[PDB]
Symmetry: none
Subunit: 75 residues, 6 copies
C-alpha cells in the first residue's frame, strides 16, 4: 500500500527594470553650440555627434533567464 | 496497490522593462546649433549627426528566456 | 503502509533596478559651448561628441538568472 | 437573576460658522484703476485679475466630523 | 442578584467661528491705482492681482471633529 | 446582592473664534498708488498684488477636536 502526492507551487516574480525609468526632466534647456573647423585632415574613419541637448539610453543587458526542473521516480 | 498524484503548479511572472519607460520630458528646449567647416579633407568613411534636441533609446538586450521540464518514471 | 506528500511553495521576488530611476532634473541649463579647430591632422579613427547638455544611461548588466530543481524518488 | 438598563442620551451640537458672516459693508467705494502695458513678453502660464472693488470668500475647511460607538457584551 | 443602570448624558456644544464675523466696514474708500509697464520680460509662471479696494477671507481650518464611545461588558 | 448606577453628565462648551471678529473700520481711506516698471526681466515664478486699500483674513487653524470615552466592566 503506497501513496505519493507531488504538488510543488511557484509564484516567484522575476523582474528587470533596466534603462531610464520614471525620471522627470522638468523644463531642461540646452545652451547655444557653435562648432567651427578649418583646413583639418583625416586619414581614417571619422564619427561625429553635435547637439544642444541629448538624452540617450542603451541596454545591451537586462535579459532575464529562468531554468526549472520537476522530477519524480518510482522503483 | 499504488497511487501517484503529480500536479505541479506555476504562476511565476517573468518581466523585462528595458529602455525608456514612464519618463516625463516636460517642456525641454534645444538651443541654437551652428556648425561651419572650410577646406576639410577626409580619406575614409565619415559618419555625422547634427541636431538641436535628440532623444534616443536602444535595447539589444531585454529578451527573457524560460526553460522548464516535468518528468515522471515508474519501474 | 507508506504515504508521501511533497508541496514546496515559492513566492520569491527577483528584482533588478539598473540605470537611472525616479530622478528629478528640475530646470537644468547647459551653458554656451564654442569649439574651434584649425589645421589639425589625424591618422587613425576619430570619434567626437559636442553638446551643451547631455544625459546618458548605459546598462550592459542587470540581467537576473534563476535556476531551480525539485526532485523526489522512491526505492 | 440579572437586570441591565442601557439608555445613553446625546444632544451635543457640532457647529461650524466658517467664512464671512454678519458683516456690514456700508457704502464702500473702489477708486479708479488704470493698467497700461507696452512691449511685454511672457513664456509660461499667466494669471491676472483687475478690479476697482473685490470682495472674496474661500472656505476649503469648515467640515464637521463625528464618530460614535455604542457597545454592550455579555458572557 | 445584579442590577446595572447606564445613562450617560451629553449636551456639549462644539463650535468654530472662523473667518470674518460681525465686522462693520462703514464707508471705506480705495484711492486711485495706476499701474504702468514697459518692455518687461517673463520666462516662468506669472500671477497678478490689481485693485483699488480688496476684502478677502480664506479659511482652510475651522473643521470640528468629535469622537465618542460608550462601552459596557459583563463576565 | 449588587447594584450599579452610572450617570456621567456633560454640558462642556468647546469654542474657537479665530480670525477677524467685531471690528469697526470707520471711514478708512487708501491713498493714491502709482506703480511703474521698465525693462524688468524675470526667470522665476512671479507673484504680484497691487492695491490702495487691502483687508485680508486667513485662518488655517481654529479647528476644535473632542475625544471622549465612557467605559464600564463587571467581572
Amino acid at each position: 500500500s503506497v501513496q505519493i502526492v507531488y504538488k510543488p507551487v511557484d509564484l516567484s516574480k522575476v523582474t528587470s527594470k533596466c534603462g531610464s525609468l520614471g525620471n522627470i526632466h522638468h523644463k531642461p534647456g540646452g545652451g547655444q553650440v557653435e562648432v567651427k573647423s578649418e583646413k583639418l585632415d583625416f586619414k581614417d574613419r571619422v564619427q561625429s555627434k553635435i547637439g544642444s541637448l541629448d538624452n540617450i539610453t542603451h541596454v545591451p543587458g537586462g535579459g532575464n533567464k529562468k531554468i526549472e526542473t520537476h522530477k519524480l521516480t518510482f522503483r
